[PDB]
Structures are given as C-alpha cells and as structure tokens.
Amino acid sequence: TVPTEGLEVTWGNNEPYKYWPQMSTNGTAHGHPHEIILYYYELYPTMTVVIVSVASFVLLSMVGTAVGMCVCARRRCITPYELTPGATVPFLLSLLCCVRTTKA
Amino acid sequence: YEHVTVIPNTVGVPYKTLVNRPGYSPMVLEMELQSVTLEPTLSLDYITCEYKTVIPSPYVKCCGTAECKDKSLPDYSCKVFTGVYPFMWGGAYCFCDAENTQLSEAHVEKSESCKTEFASAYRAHTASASAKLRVLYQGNNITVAAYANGDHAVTVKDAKFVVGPMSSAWTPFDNKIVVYKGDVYNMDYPPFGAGRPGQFGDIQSRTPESKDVYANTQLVLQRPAAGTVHVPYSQAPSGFKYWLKERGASLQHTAPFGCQIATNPVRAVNCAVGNIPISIDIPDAAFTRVVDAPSVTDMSCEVPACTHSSDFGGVAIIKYTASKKGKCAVHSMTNAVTIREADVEVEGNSQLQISFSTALASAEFRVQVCSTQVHCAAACHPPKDHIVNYPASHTTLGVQDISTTAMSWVQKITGGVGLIVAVAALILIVVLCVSFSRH
Ligand SMILES: *[C@@H]1O[C@H](CO)[C@@H](O)[C@H](O)[C@H]1NC(C)=O
Numbered sequence: 001t002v003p004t005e006g007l008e009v010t011w012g013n014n015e016p017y018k019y020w021p022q023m024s025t026n027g028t029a030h031g032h033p034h035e036i037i038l039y040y041y042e043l044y045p046t047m048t049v050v051i052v053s054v055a056s057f058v059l060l061s062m063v064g065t066a067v068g069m070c071v072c073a074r075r076r077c078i079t080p081y082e083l084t085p086g087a088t089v090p091f092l093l094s095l096l097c098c099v100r101t102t103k104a
Numbered sequence: 105y106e107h108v109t110v111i112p113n114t115v116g117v118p119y120k121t122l123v124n125r126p127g128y129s130p131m132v133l134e135m136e137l138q139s140v141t142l143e144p145t146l147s148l149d150y151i152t153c154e155y156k157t158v159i160p161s162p163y164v165k166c167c168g169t170a171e172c173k174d175k176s177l178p179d180y181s182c183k184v185f186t187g188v189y190p191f192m193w194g195g196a197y198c199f200c201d202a203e204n205t206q207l208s209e210a211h212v213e214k215s216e217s218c219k220t221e222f223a224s225a226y227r228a229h230t231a232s233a234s235a236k237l238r239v240l241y242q243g244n245n246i247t248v249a250a251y252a253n254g255d256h257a258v259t260v261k262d263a264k265f266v267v268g269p270m271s272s273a274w275t276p277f278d279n280k281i282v283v284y285k286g287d288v289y290n291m292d293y294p295p296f297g298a299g300r301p302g303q304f305g306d307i308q309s310r311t312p313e314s315k316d317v318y319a320n321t322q323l324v325l326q327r328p329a330a331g332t333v334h335v336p337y338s339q340a341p342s343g344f345k346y347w348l349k350e351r352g353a354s355l356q357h358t359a360p361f362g363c364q365i366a367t368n369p370v371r372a373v374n375c376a377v378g379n380i381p382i383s384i385d386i387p388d389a390a391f392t393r394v395v396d397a398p399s400v401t402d403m404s405c406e407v408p409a410c411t412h413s414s415d416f417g418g419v420a421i422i423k424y425t426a427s428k429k430g431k432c433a434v435h436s437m438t439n440a441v442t443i444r445e446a447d448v449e450v451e452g453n454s455q456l457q458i459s460f461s462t463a464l465a466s467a468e469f470r471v472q473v474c475s476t477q478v479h480c481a482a483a484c485h486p487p488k489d490h491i492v493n494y495p496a497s498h499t500t501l502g503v504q505d506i507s508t509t510a511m512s513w514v515q516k517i518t519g520g521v522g523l524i525v526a527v528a529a530l531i532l533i534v535v536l537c538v539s540f541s542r543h
Contacts, residue, residue, distance in 0.1 A: 002491050008362060019491050022414050026486040030465060036510040039465060042486075048503065062520050069525035076532035 074099045105391065108383045113271070114376045115139060117497045120442065122435045122472075123386070129397040130475065131390070132435045134446055135382070138236035140252060142363070142372040144228040144277045150296050151225070153218035154345050155307045155319065159210040162328075162335045164190065166200040170207035178317055182209035183325035190333035197333060206328060208335045212319050218312050223304070223344065225282045225293045228370075233270050235380075240446055242390060252380060264385040272378030276359035286367050287354045299343075306343035398450060399427035400474035407482030410467055414496035416444050416459040417487065418467065420480055425453040432474045434458065441469050442498035450474070463501035466508035483508065 006020030028038030040048040077098040081089065093104045107123040115137040124130035163170055172182040187202045198204060233252035238245050241261060250256040254269030278290040282304070291304070299305040299320050308318040321340035328334055356365045363375030402425035411417035418441075426432075433447045441462040448456055462469075468481045507514055533540065 006495070010357065018493055018495070020493075020495060022489050022492045023412065023486050024490055026488065028486065030483065030508045030510060034510060034513065036507065036513075039510075044503075048505070059517070059520070062522055066521045066525045069528050073528045073532055076536065080535075 105388065106383065106385050108381065110271075110379050110381045111135065111137075112376070112497065113137075113140070113378045113380055114495075114497055115374050116495050118444075120435065120446070122433075122437075123384075125391055128388075128391040128393050130433060130435075132433050132446055133384075134240035136238040138238055138247070139373055140233065140235040140375075142231045142233055142275060142277075142375075143369060144231035144275065144372070146370070147227045147229075149225045149227045149280070149293070151218075151222050151309050151312055152299075152305055152307050152344050153222040153309070153312075154215050154342050155212050155321075156215045157210060157212050157323075157337065157339050159208075159335050159337060162333075163207040164197065164204070164333065165207070166198040166204040168203075169205045172207070172209070175209070175211065177211040178213070179319040179321050179323050180209065180211040181323040181325060182207070184208075185327050188328055189331065190328075191331050192333060208325050208328075210323055210325070210335070210337055210339075212307075212321055212323065212339075214307070214309060214317050218309070221285070222312060223282060223284050223347075225280070225305070227280050228277055229279050231275055231277065231372075233268060235267060237265075237267065239265075243447075254381070262387045262389065266383045267380060270378060270380065274377055276355065276361070276363045276365075276372050276375065283367065283370065284348075284351070287351070288356075288365055288367070288370060289351065290355055290358075301340045302343040302346065304343060304347040306340075394475065396430075397432060397474060398430040400432070400450065400476050401425045402453070403476060403478040405471070405478045405480040407467070407480060410462065410482045410484040411487050412462050412464065412467075412484040412499070413487045413489075414461070414492050414494075414499065416461050418460040418462050418482070418484065420458050420460060420471075420482075421455060422458065422471075422478060423455045424450060424473075426450040426474070428452070434471065434473045436460070436469060436471055438469045440464055440499075440501060441467060443471075448473075461496070461499045463499040464506045466506045468506065 002019055002021045004021060006018065008016050008018045010016040024042035025038070028042050029035045030039070037049065037052070040052070077092075077096070078100075087104075089104050092098070093101055105123070105125055107121075109121045111119045111121075118134050118136045120132050120134055122130060122132040169186075170184055172184065174180075175182075185206045185208075186204070188204060188206050189201060190197045190206075235250065235252040237248045237250075239248060240246075241263070246260060248258055248260055248265055250258045250265065250267050252268040252270055254266070256268075257264055257266045259265075280290075280292050282289045282291050282293055294300055294303070294305040296305075296308050297318050299308050299318065301320055301322060306320065310316065322338070323340065324338040326336040326338060328336055354365075359365065359372070359375070361375035361377055363372040365372050402423065404423040406421050406423075408419065408421065410419065429449070429451050431447050432450050434443060434445060436443050441460060441464070443458060443460045445458055448458075450456075458471075462484060464484070466481075466483050468479075470477045470479055
C-alpha cells in the first residue's frame with residue numbers, strides 16, 4: 001500500500017523500483033448529482049470530509065438557535081398578552097398567528 | 105541585478121523562478137537538482153579484523169618440571185601438566201612414566217589479511233553539503249557545482265551563483281558508525297580496550313599497520329589427551345567474522361528519506377529534506393529592455409481538454425497578436441499550476457499551444473506572457489492510473505481546493521436564517537422597549 005510520499009522496493013541485486021501514488025479514481029465527478037464526497041474521499045481521504053461533518057453539526061447549530069429564536073418570539077409575543085383583562089387581539093393573533101391561534 | 109529565491113530540497117523536479125526587473129523584459133529561469141551530497145566528518149576511532157592464534161611447539165620434559173615465565177604479549181597464556189605419557193609413531197617419547205611434565209603456552213596476534221579486509225569504526229559527527237544544479241540560461245542547459253552551505257560562490261557565464269545553507273541540519277548518519285568494504289552501519293561499538301568476546305570489537309587495533317593491539321579471548325588451556333602429544337587450546341571464537349554473519353540491514357535501506365550512501369569517500373546523497381536558498385547575481389547583458397521585446401495584444405485562452413496528473417496532462421491553446429517576431433517568456437503566477445515551457449517565439453496574430461500540470465479538479469488560473477495576463481478556465485478529469493514511477497512534485501495542492509461547480513452548492517448552502525432570527529429578536533426587544541428602557 002503506497003503512502004502519499006512514495007515507496008521504494010529493492011529486489012535482489014537489481015536496481016530498486018520506485019512507486020509513488022497518483023490520484024486514486026475516476027469514480028468521483030462534478031455534475032448535477034453532487035458526487036463531490038467521492039472527490040474529497042479519494043483525494044485527501046478522512047480530510048476535507050470530516051470537515052463536512054463539522055460543517056454539518058455547525059449548520060445544525062445555527063438552525064437550532066433559529067428555532068430558539070422562534071420560541072423566544074413566541075413567548076415575547078404572548079407575554080404582552082399574558083392574559084390581559086381585555087383579552088382581545090382581533091388584528092394580531094387572528095392575523096399574525098404567533099402562538100395558540102386556536103384562541104383568537 | 106541580484107535575485108534571491110528558495111526551492112524545496114528535491115531532485116529531478118524542475119523549478120521555475122521568475123525574476124522581473126523594471127525597464128526590462130522579465131525572465132523566468134528553470135533550475136533542477138542533479139544531486140546533493142552530504143559529506144560527514146571522519147574521525148577514525150579504530151579498526152578490527154580476524155585474529156590468528158599462535159601456539160608454538162609445546163615444551164615436553166621427563167623426570168623434571170617446567171615453569172611459566174610471563175610474556176608481555178596480548179592475552180598470552182600458559183599452563184603445565186603432569187603425568188602425561190605421550191606416544192609417537194616409533195613408540196613412547198620417553199621412559200619417565202609419570203615424572204614427566206608438559207608446558208604449553210599461546211598468544212593471539214593480528215592477521216596479515218587485516219591489511220586487505222577489515223571493519224573500521226569512526227565517530228563522524230557533523231557534515232558538509234555539496235550539490236549539482238542545472239540551469240536554463242539564454243536557452244541552454246548549464247551545469248554548476250558548489251558547496252550547499254551558503255558560503256561557496258561560483259561564477260559561470262558572467263553570473264554569480266550562491267547556494268545554501270541547507271535549511272535542515274538533519275542527517276541520516278550518527279555520531280558513531282562502522283564501515284565494511286562498501287557498507288555502512290549505525291551501531292554503537294564498544295569502547296576501545298573493552299572488547300566483549302564474540303561481538304564486534306573483540307579485537308581492537310589502532311591502525312591496520314600498527315603492531316600494538318588489544319585482545320580479550322579467554323585463552324584457557326586444557327590437559328592434553330592421554331597417550332598423545334599435542335596442544336589443546338580453548339581459543340575464543342572470533343566475534344569479528346561472526347558479526348559479518350549477522351550484520352543486518354545496511355543504512356542505504358534504513359535511512360529515512362532514502363539518502364543513497366557511497367564510500368571512498370562516505371557520502372549521503374539524494375535525500376529530500378528542507379529547502380535551499382539560492383542567490384543569483386545576473387549581469388544586465390542578459391536583461392533586455394521592454395521596448396526590445398515585441399508587444400502582445402488580443403489575448404484569448406481555451407482548453408480543449410485537461411487531465412490533472414503527475415505529468416503535463418493539461419494542454420492550453422492561446423490566440424495572441426504581437427507587434428513583431430521575437431522571443432517572450434511565459435509563466436504562471438499561481439503555485440497550484442506549473443508550466444513545462446519557459447519561453448516561446450511570437451510572430452504576431454497567431455496562436456500557440458502550451459503543456460502544463462495541475463492538481464485542481466477545475467483549473468482556473470491566470471498566465472503571464474510579455475508582461476500581460478490571460479485567464480484560463482477548464483474542468484480536468486481524473487486519469488486512470490493510481491500510481492506512477494517517475495517523481496513529480498510540481499502539482500502540489502493544499503487544503504484549500506476548488507470545489508468547482510460544487511463551490512456554488514456550498515455558496516448556496518452558506519445561506520442561513522440567522523438574519524431573520526436576529527430581525528425577530530430586534531423586533532421583540534423594541535416592541536418591549538415601550539417598557540424596556542436601558543436594562
Ligand atoms: C535541456 O534538458 C532537456 C531535458 O530533456 C532537454 O530536452 C533539452 O534538449 C536540453 N537543452 C536545452 C533545453 O537547451
């Protein structure tokens with residue numbers, strides 16, 4: 001199994017033969033179907049691919065804080081209500097539908 | 105003019121270095137490493153070889169006794185025995201049945217074969233570097249040789265070259281080494297005068313010709329076989345000859361970076377480690393004023409096909425228009441791609457083809473010629489072979505790489521909803537600011 005930096009083999013008293021890797025495969029290809037994971041695996045395996053994993057979890061993190069803002073906006077919009085004595089939002093919950101739009 | 109550059113310590117890989125000088129046509133030189141030699145110090149610690157055991161004719165005696173007189177010889181030993189009744193062909197040597205005695209002694213000396221065959225232990229510590237370079241100058245390959253330590257300066261074709269010092273002080277050798285006729289071994293020999301029997305250094309000699317020697321062979325005698333005249337010896341087996349039997353792998357295989365090792369003198373050659381600084385003082389005679397060079401205009405580039413590989417798998421066709429016939433240099437200012445060719449003749453409104461090597465899946469780069477830039481965009485494809493014999497380090501690709509079309513994909517992925525969530529937070533906090541003042 002050749003390393004990225006090359007490998008040389010000596011056989012008998014004959015001059016040693018040197019083999020060093022070239023790019024791996026044609027299997028990867030750029031096109032409408034991504035097929036880039038094969039690019040970044042065949043070339044630099046385990047690198048620029050776990051990088052995709054960290055990108056995945058961080059994008060999950062931004063969407064998580066986004067749903068966090070969703071719930072925060074929900075509580076912030078219902079709080080001025082906080083069951084006011086008037087108990088009426090004909091133009092906000094009937095229209096904005098912030099939270100529990102079943103009622104009003 | 106003086107130009108300074110640095111190149112990776114590698115052999116057989118051409119390197120382009122573009123020296124530019126205002127008021128004159130910039131020129132790009134091709135430099136190649138033929139070989140780099142590392143000569144280590146030589147402090148001959150000592151030598152060793154097979155030993156010869158000298159045991160002169162034993163002293164026999166009857167009705168009387170012999171005696172041991174000390175001899176100032178290496179590992180000299182002696183012994184006496186009694187009651188021996190040796191017999192020869194014609195009968196008993198002598199009559200005294202048991203009153204007789206035998207004295208024996210022996211010593212060990214160096215062998216004349218040492219003058220031809222032997223193993224020598226040195227304590228080489230440091231080294232110096234010498235190297236061979238090939239340079240494309242004025243359209244011809246020129247060879248230069250110099251010490252790669254940043255000191256030796258060499259004049260060739262009116263230009264001054266200085267090479268080195270080696271960036272890395274690493275060596276494949278070791279403080280202590282042992283050399284056979286044509287083989288070298290990293291191995292800690294025992295200190296002189298303390299040779300362990302049956303191992304390397306069992307006999308120590310300062311030089312192949314020095315008469316003085318040191319030995320350690322436990323030469324113990326034994327009682328001779330009854331009824332016979334002879335000398336037995338418990339000569340220690342020679343550790344030197346034996347070490348030749350279990351030498352093991354030579355350093356030419358165990359050396360990291362595969363620095364080929366020679367002898368007479370001992371050198372380590374062709375190992376890629378670190379880089380080399382090169383300073384070239386080039387007389388202005390080679391330099392040509394920009395006005396001399398023909399102009400260039402109407403630059404178009406195209407790539408009928410390209411194939412990222414260790415070879416020059418990329419081909420680019422460029423349409424150009426120039427003022428007049430003349431030579432003009434060509435270069436790529438992006439390290440991610442290399443061009444085999446250095447310069448080319450340009451006649452005018454014509455075209456040309458160039459062979460280059462790259463590593464990017466999609467090759468998008470500028471090319472410089474006649475102090476002008478031309479873009480080039482193409483989509484290479486993977487070749488079929490996975491491993492090649494000849495070396496090629498030109499096409500080096502860092503962690504940064506072109507996602508090509510997929511780049512747009514990630515550019516599309518980068519879009520996030522943080523803007524809308526921040527907007528919602530701002531809206532809620534303000535509509536609260538009616539009651540939230542400064543907290
Ligand atoms: C220089 O070396 C290259 C290596 O193959 C050879 O093709 C060329 O003819 C040599 N001479 C030059 C470039 O003048």
